[PDB]
Structure formats: C-alpha cells, structure tokens
C-alpha cells in the first residue's frame, strides 16, 4: 500500500554490448547427452550449462 515518500536515484552503465543481436532469428538445436536434459535456452555466452 502507501509507503513513506521515497526519492531514489539509480546509476547503471548500460553500455556493455558489441555486435548487438537482431530482433529476428531463432535457432533450435536438439542434442544427445547424458546431462542437462530438457530445454535450456541460451541468450548469450555467459549463460551456458556447465
């Protein structure tokens, strides 16, 4: 509900990109392995199953 009046200033550096991804284009890959079974969406390199 109503809280105390709040003034918050946020600093964020949204400049961390190169070769930006296109809005279009979706690739689906199916693989045979013993682990990580199921769907694992991969948005970029940092989130890769280990």
């Amino acid at each position: 509900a109503i809280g105390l009046p709040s003034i918050n200033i946020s600093f964020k550096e949204l400049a961390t990109t190169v070769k930006e991804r296109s809005a279009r284009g979706i690739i689906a890959m199916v693989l045979k392995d013993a682990k990580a079974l199921g769907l694992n969406e991969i948005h970029e390199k940092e989130d890769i199953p280990v």
């Binding site: 400049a15 990109t17 190169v18 930006e20």
Partner: protein
C-alpha cells in the same frame, strides 16, 4: 582513436572530424608525431670543372 571508438561500439557515421577528435575516450590518450633525425657527414662527392 577511431579504432578504439569502433571497438567500444559507438557509431561514427555522422560525426565530423572535430567531433571524433574530441570524443570521450576515458583514461586512454592517443597521439602521433613526425620528426626527422639529422646525421653527421659520412659521404662526400665533388665535381670540378677545370
């Protein structure tokens, strides 16, 4: 400087040469210079007309 800016990902298509000259680069500074190094005489050639 242009290569560094392109690596940063900024678009230089519309900027003037002056604008790219004074674009913010952070800590790094890029400069270049031209000099010519003198040398003492080592070879002498003379032609004499009698």
């Amino acid at each position: 400087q242009k290569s560094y800016l392109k690596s940063k990902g900024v678009d230089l298509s519309y900027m003037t040469l002056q604008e790219i000259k004074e674009a913010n680069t952070g800590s790094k500074v890029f400069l270049k210079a031209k000099i010519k190094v003198l040398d003492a005489m080592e070879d002498i050639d003379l032609s004499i007309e009698i």
